């Protein structure tokens, strides 16, 4: 199939690393500009966590699309198009912890 | 040649002036003002965020 930006996973992994460097070097500015009440480590760990969620992906086309969406998210953060509400949406705080144990799920509700 | 006839360690780092005395222009480009002509603005019809 026709590629999007890369023809090999190695080429696709290169763009992921480039995005990570841009994201990693942006977190100190994001905390400073948005006046976040978190630490630089928390944001950088959060960036790592979101990258690690899409770690099982093997199709280079999907990898390119994820980086394309990754750059779009970074542009909003750099340009302060996002707000403190948008930035802190990754750090789910109002959401109560949902246990993943069967017995805990059994006690709560009919959730399969 | 050089900046001074008897250069020292501090002065040796300093290069001679340009041949036409035209110093290379600096790249300290002036940043604009990203005013937010946002939704609340009366001329923005209430639901227009104009990032100018």
């Amino acid at each position: 199939v026709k590629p999007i930006f890369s023809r090999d996973m190695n080429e696709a992994k290169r763009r992921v690393r480039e995005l990570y460097r841009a994201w990693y070097r942006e977190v100190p500015n994001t905390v400073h500009l948005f006046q976040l009440d978190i630490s630089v480590k928390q944001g950088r760990d959060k960036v790592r966590e979101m990258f690690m969620k899409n770690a099982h992906v093997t199709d280079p086309r999907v990898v390119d699309l994820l980086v394309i969406k990754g750059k779009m998210e970074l542009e909003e953060t750099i340009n302060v198009w996002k707000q403190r509400t948008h930035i802190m949406r990754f750090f789910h705080e109002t959401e109560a912890p949902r246990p993943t144990d069967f017995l805990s799920k059994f006690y709560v509700g009919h959730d399969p | 040649g050089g900046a001074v006839m008897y250069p020292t360690k501090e002065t040796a780092h300093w290069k001679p002036p340009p041949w036409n005395d035209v110093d290379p222009p600096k790249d300290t480009l002036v940043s604009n003002l990203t005013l937010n002509f946002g939704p609340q603005h009366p001329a923005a019809h209430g639901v227009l965020r104009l990032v100018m």
Binding site: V31, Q35, D37, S39, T94, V108, G109, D111 | -
Partner: protein, 340 residues
């Protein structure tokens, strides 16, 4: 009799069966207790003696019909009856740090608690959550802590199976502890008895206290237990205030003020018919070191791990900074020395 089966996913439109009457919900802790109750889908009943305007901020905390506002009178048991009649949980947060014209520490920390506890038994309320103060002593130097101890015994007499919570010094965005010290900059220096070297405080975050109350209701074993909500670190008064003036980027000028002079200053600020900036009991309570009660369960027993003050102090004191130090992060200021 009023037993409800929880339904949903614990969200805003869910059903939790935690129909509650939060007395004094129009206050620092009240807001968070109501918000935690509201987000789970609980029928929160909010009695209020203030103007409905002051209760407006509680309205978005719950879904449609999940936040009912109805007036109550602390000196009228009948008004208490109609607000706890259909509640399976009653939480008492009514408490003023200053004696008023018509209400004295005895009337707010003894009479009202007893009335709430007594009436709740009559209506058949299952669980009651009373909020005392860690340093509640029957012979305490402060009348505030004095009445806080008398009322604690009366609640257990009126309501034998009632959970009693003794928070240390709750700190938060609308707090009168962290903001209290940060607001002393307007008076020049920072008057501290013995320069704050003879007082140890263990403040608690507002969110942790609120989640402890909610977990106490959810916990089936909290009935009759006496909890003590404290923070994870103990600070000297001087070290704590210096850290408060550190993240606030204010010039810290501490001068030792003798106890009699500080009490005299406190008396002067009691003249204000509005909310006093400080009180004689406020001075004594601040100078009084926090008690340690290892024989009582805390936040840890309820599953909530206490949040260190260092992590949640930037939120409170950011508004107290000038334009120069608004965007500074929360990591530049080093944590104060803890006496642990």
């Amino acid at each position: 009799h009023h037993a409800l089966i929880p339904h949903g996913k614990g969200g805003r439109s869910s059903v939790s069966g935690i129909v509650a009457t939060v007395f004094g919900a129009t206050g620092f802790l009240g807001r968070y207790v109501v918000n935690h109750l509201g987000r789970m889908g609980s029928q929160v009943i909010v009695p209020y003696r203030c103007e409905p305007y002051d209760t407006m901020h509680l309205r978005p905390m719950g879904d449609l019909g999940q936040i009912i506002f109805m007036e109550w009178n602390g000196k009228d048991k009948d008004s208490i009856r109609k607000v706890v009649e259909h509640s399976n949980v009653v939480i008492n947060l009514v408490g003023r740090e200053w004696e008023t014209k018509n209400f004295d520490f005895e009337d707010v920390f003894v009479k009202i608690p007893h009335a709430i506890a007594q009436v709740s038994k009559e209506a058949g309320v299952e669980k009651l959550i009373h909020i005392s103060h860690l340093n509640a002593d029957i012979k305490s130097p402060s009348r505030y802590l004095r009445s806080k101890a008398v009322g604690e015994k009366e609640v257990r007499a009126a309501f034998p199976e009632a959970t009693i919570i003794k928070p240390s010094d709750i700190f938060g965005r609308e707090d009168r502890f962290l903001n209290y010290f940060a607001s002393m900059r307007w008076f020049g220096g920072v008057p501290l008895i013995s320069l704050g070297k003879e007082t140890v405080k263990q403040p608690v975050y507002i969110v942790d206290v609120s989640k402890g109350i909610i977990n106490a209701i959810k916990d089936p074993d909290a009935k009759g237990k006496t909890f003590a909500f404290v923070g994870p670190n103990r600070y000297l008064l001087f070290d704590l205030v210096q850290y408060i003036f550190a993240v606030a980027y204010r010039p810290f000028l501490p001068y030792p003020l003798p106890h009699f002079a500080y009490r005299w200053v406190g008396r002067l600020f009691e003249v204000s018919p509005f909310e006093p900036w400080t009180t004689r009991d406020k001075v004594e309570r601040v100078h009084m070191s926090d008690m340690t009660l290892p024989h009582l369960p805390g936040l840890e027993d309820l599953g909530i791990q206490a949040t260190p003050l260092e992590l949640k102090a930037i939120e409170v004191l950011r508004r107290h900074r000038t334009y120069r130090w608004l965007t500074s992060e929360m990591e530049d200021v080093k944590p104060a020395k803890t006496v642990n």
